Design a protein around this ligand. Structure first.
Ligand SMILES: CN(C)C(=O)CCN(C(=O)[C@@H]1CCCN1C(=O)[C@@H](NC(=O)c1cc2cc(C(F)(F)P(=O)(O)O)ccc2s1)C(C)(C)C)c1ccc2scnc2c1
Length: 555
């Protein structure tokens, strides 16, 4: 990888300095224990002076006992300042380790984890998959091991201090180290409670749904031994906003979810601690445009780490969800989700989005969504984007760079209607994706549908072509309509436009079968023979058993 090597180098340095301070601490314990024994030897001198009944040998033993006393008192005094100096040195080393650790955690949590979440958010719009949490968990486990080893080293150092107090700067250094450890652990625990698999963002009521919540530090802390219950709740955008500023009622919810409790399972030979909610269902939704109303599944859990007196209340909000009830609401609910996933700013307050965006930014969102909806690598070309910009901005320019600095508001996108129509831009664009997705994925993928050309453009492309040359185009006046533009010289007219076919027409007779019926359609623009493009789709009429055919037979 690239910057991942520097992260791994910092982990190896943190591992080394943590081992060094463990070695210094064992030495500090031994120095203090030997000092305690030597202090008791100085008390043993005074008892020895009271044990000389004896006659002439009393003077010889007294002079030696006094010399031992002088040397031991001088040793004890030097050792007391050595104990002091080593405590300060150990505390300075712990401070240094915690500062390097804070910088490393900042990279993992505010950079790498945020990028993974942004990829997850964009995947909701058709973007490339976030990928596995394997390296994030591997990094978080190391942060947990290093913070924990350092915490138990400083608690051992504190215990040596309470057993043999030496007043001075050490107490303030230890208080500062304890405040630092407490901040690192809380940030790590609260930030590694993440949603691995988001619930659906266009959420239909009474529909079984799933979500997976994982705790990246579960394996390396005392959490997997007593796996906590995770509770899912649906809350409104306002309730989510109040929860973030801690100004909430502690129970506010906007509906009920069935099978909303789940105990995290620990998977050994992976180290993963996760709650797999597989059978959730929105039983009811409480409402305050319904299709613009955002909710979030709040996941919350409470667990302790290593000790009774160390409990965390973790909370994580899913990506905003639009709740629907009928299915016909999915199309408008999708626009709200699309704009949010694409244009949410980092560090925003629960579910704020920019009012307007630049046309190239919207292009990137529509192309991503289009490719995922039609399941093709054939997305929106520069010419398709120009056609869409012309429809949106009511502009004539055929140059994509002329739209680069133009902005599109949420209202121009899915509120106000296009120039002379009773529909919005999004309704039209989603009408195209829906008619393609429903019946024409292989035709779109094959290049059989030009689509994003206007009536005048189709006219100019077909004028000088042989009779019977045609193209398939998206209708301007009918949502989800596909119209045939064709050239065929006749006294009354040479360039023709067929009345659009919609999903109802396609359900009665497929596009390819209708094209096969029209004998005046001979070449698909530019020069491809019709049967070469559509014959694989023609229906081979099958005889029926009700008509006496005992075996499958084509008529
Ligand atoms: C009758 N059967 C069985 C057929 O399939 C034959 C084809 N057919 C027709 O001939 C229909 C019947 C009425 C006239 N007609 C036409 O096609 C005639 N054309 C038309 O009636 C029209 C052409 C356009 C083009 C657009 C447009 F370009 F897409 P837009 O971008 O929105 O401006 C919009 C509305 C119309 S109405 C034509 C060929 C001049 C004769 C037709 C076409 C589509 C449908 S959908 C349901 N019935 C039909 C019938």
């Amino acid at each position: 990888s690239q910057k991942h090597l520097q992260i791994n180098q910092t982990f190896e340095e943190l591992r080394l300095v943590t081992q060094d301070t463990e070695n210094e601490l064992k030495k500090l314990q031994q120095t203090q224990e030997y000092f305690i024994i030597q202090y008791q030897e100085s008390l043993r001198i005074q008892a020895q002076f009271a044990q000389l009944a004896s006659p002439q040998e009393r003077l010889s033993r007294e002079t030696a006992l006094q010399q031992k006393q002088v040397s031991l008192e001088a040793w004890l005094q030097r050792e007391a300042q050595t104990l002091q100096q080593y405590r300060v040195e150990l505390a300075e080393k712990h401070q240094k380790t915690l500062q390097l650790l804070r910088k490393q955690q900042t990279i993992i949590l505010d950079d790498e984890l945020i990028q993974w979440k942004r990829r997850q958010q964009l995947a909701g719009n058709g973007g490339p998959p976030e990928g596995s949490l394997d390296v994030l968990q591997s990094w978080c486990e190391k942060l947990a091991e290093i913070i924990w080893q350092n915490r138990q080293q400083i608690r051992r150092a504190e215990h040596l201090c309470q057993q043999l107090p030496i007043p001075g700067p050490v107490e303030e250094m230890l208080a500062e180290v304890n405040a630092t450890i407490t901040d690192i652990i809380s940030a790590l625990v609260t930030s590694t409670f993440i949603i691995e698999k988001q619930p659906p963002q266009v959420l239909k009521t009474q529909t079984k749904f799933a979500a997976t919540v994982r705790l990246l530090v579960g394996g390396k802390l005392n959490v997997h031994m007593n796996p906590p219950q995770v509770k899912a709740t649906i809350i409104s955008e306002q309730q989510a906003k109040s929860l973030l500023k801690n100004e909430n009622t502690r129970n506010e919810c906007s509906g009920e979810i069935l099978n909303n409790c789940c105990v995290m399972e620990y998977h050994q030979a992976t180290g993963t601690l996760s709650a797999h909610f597989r059978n959730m269902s929105l039983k009811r939704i409480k409402r305050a445009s319904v299709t613009e109303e955002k909710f979030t599944v709040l996941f919350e859990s409470q667990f302790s780490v290593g000790s009774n007196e160390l409990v965390f209340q973790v909370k994580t909000l899913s990506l905003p969800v639009v709740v629907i009830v009928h299915g016909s609401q999915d199309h408008n609910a999708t626009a709200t989700v699309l704009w949010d996933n694409a244009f949410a700013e980092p560090g925003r307050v629960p579910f704020a989005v920019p009012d307007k965006v630049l046309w190239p930014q919207l292009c990137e969102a529509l192309n991503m969504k289009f490719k995922a909806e039609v399941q093709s690598n054939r997305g929106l070309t520069k010419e398709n984007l120009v056609f869409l910009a012309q429809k949106l901005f009511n502009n004539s320019s055929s140059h994509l760079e002329d739209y680069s600095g133009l902005s599109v508001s949420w209202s121009q996108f899915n509120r106000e209607n296009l120039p002379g129509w009773n529909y919005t831009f999004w309704q039209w664009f989603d009408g195209v994706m829906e008619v393609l997705k429903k019946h024409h994925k292989p035709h779109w993928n094959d290049g059989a549908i030009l689509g994003f050309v206007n009536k005048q453009q189709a006219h100019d492309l077909l004028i000088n072509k042989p009779d019977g040359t045609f193209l398939l185009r998206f209708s301007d006046s009918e949502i989800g309509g596909i119209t045939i533009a064709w050239k065929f010289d006749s006294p009354e007219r040479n360039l023709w436009n067929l009345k659009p076919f919609t999903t109802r027409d396609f359900s009665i007779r497929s596009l390819a079968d209708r094209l096969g019926d029209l004998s005046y359609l001979i070449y698909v623009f530019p020069d491809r023979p019709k049967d070469e493009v559509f014959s694989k789709y023609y229906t081979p009429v099958l005889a029926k058993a009700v008509d006496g055919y005992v075996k499958p037979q084509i008529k």
